[PDB]
């Protein structure tokens, strides 16, 4: 499954 | 920005035999950016209801797509792929060679 933490470059 | 011209291969899934059902493929790989136009031609005419894989990409970040349709090859029917891309001055037509 895809990761549910998000990061702005 | 990086722009890469697509590499185009037109091939069948299985070795072609006249009268046996098969899949005609046009593989466009190595291209950037992601907008591209691909048609499959039967005797110079656009085949309807052609499918494609989902936009994906390789280790070098270049995109690849597969366009394909069921077909039954014959001795006389010619098939081709026509690709348009911002890197092309005109669309590139690659003929299907059953030996290739």
């Amino acid at each position: 499954s895809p990761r549910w933490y998000f990061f702005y470059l | 920005m990086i722009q890469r011209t697509p590499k185009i291969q037109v091939y069948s899934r299985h070795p072609a035999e006249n009268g046996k059902s098969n899949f005609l493929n046009c593989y466009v790989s190595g291209f950037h950016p992601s907008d591209i136009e691909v048609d499959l031609l039967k005797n110079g005419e656009r085949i309807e209801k052609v499918e494609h894989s989902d936009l994906s990409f390789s280790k070098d970040w270049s995109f690849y797509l597969l366009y394909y349709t069921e077909f039954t090859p014959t001795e006389k029917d010619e098939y081709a792929c026509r690709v348009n891309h911002v890197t092309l001055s005109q669309p590139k037509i690659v003929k299907w060679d059953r030996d290739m």
Binding site: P2 | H14, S62, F63
Partner: protein, 275 residues
């Protein structure tokens, strides 16, 4: 054998025409199992392999929510990249993301991957230690410093060492024979006369999985890299792959050349000749 899980995200800005197009595909090895596209009629994670269809509606609902948040995140990454590179707000730009885990036959992590490209060029990549960054240029260094200060590597390490491995193990169980298979290449050589003084030898590999293969020609054991035409490995449509390598050879000296095939499905690599 060894296994990988990867997600591939593509975001493409379209100024004045709404939200950027966001597309995700997921792979175990060279098998696509999922896709998500923000342009589709009701944007939903969809299956693209038989063995993931057994997952319940909650799995699809959950992944759908994740991609929807990811699309908004990438939109803001694109806004930020425009500033860093001091670009127009008028033209289209692309942000690509690739992450996942490799596991050995033992099913433990070998290597985690987490990396980005802007407009087709390397931007930033998480190092093999999963604690540090390689920035491709001075703009990426801006991203590097905000990520280091906020310790965001630790969160990325937790997914790649933990969940990524657990999901991959479950997908391998779900897939059984259809993912543990190596299909060896079906190989032959064809001879195509060019002139009285020259002929093309084409060495074929058909129906192989996975995609990784080395196809090479040799003249009496010597490399023919600059004289070898080599097509890009191409999908057959049925989750196997194809490749050929050709080399123009002086007529009568065919016995001098040998095609070499290495593939996971061949314990010993093949040497094909023409007598």
């Amino acid at each position: 054998g060894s296994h990988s899980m990867r997600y591939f995200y593509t975001s493409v800005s379209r100024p004045g025409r709404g939200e950027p197009r966001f597309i995700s595909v997921g792979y175990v090895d060279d098998t696509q199992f999922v896709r998500f596209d923000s342009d589709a009629a009701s944007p939903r994670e969809e299956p693209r392999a038989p063995w993931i269809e057994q997952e319940g509606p909650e799995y699809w609902d959950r992944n759908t929510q994740i991609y929807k948040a990811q699309a908004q995140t990438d939109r803001e990454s694109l806004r930020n990249l425009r500033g860093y590179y001091n670009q127009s707000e008028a033209g289209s730009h692309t942000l690509q993301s690739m992450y996942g885990c490799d596991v050995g036959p033992d099913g433990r992590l070998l290597r985690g991957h987490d990396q980005y490209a802007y407009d087709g060029k390397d931007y930033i990549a998480l190092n093999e230690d999963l604690r540090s960054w390689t920035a491709a240029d001075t703009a990426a260094q801006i991203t590097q410093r905000k990520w280091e200060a906020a310790r965001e590597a630790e969160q990325r390490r937790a997914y790649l060492e933990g969940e990524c491995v657990e999901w991959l193990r479950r997908y391998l169980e779900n897939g059984k024979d259809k993912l543990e298979r190596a299909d060896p290449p079906k190989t032959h050589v064809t001879h195509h006369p060019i002139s009285d003084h020259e002929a093309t030898l084409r060495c074929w590999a058909l129906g192989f999985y996975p995609a990784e293969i080395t196809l090479t020609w040799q003249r009496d054991g010597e490399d023919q890299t600059q004289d070898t035409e080599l097509v890009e490995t191409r999908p057959a449509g049925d989750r196997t792959f194809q490749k050929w390598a050709a080399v123009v050879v002086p007529s009568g000296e065919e016995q001098r050349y040998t095609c070499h095939v290495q593939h996971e499905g061949l314990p010993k690599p093949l040497t094909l000749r023409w007598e």
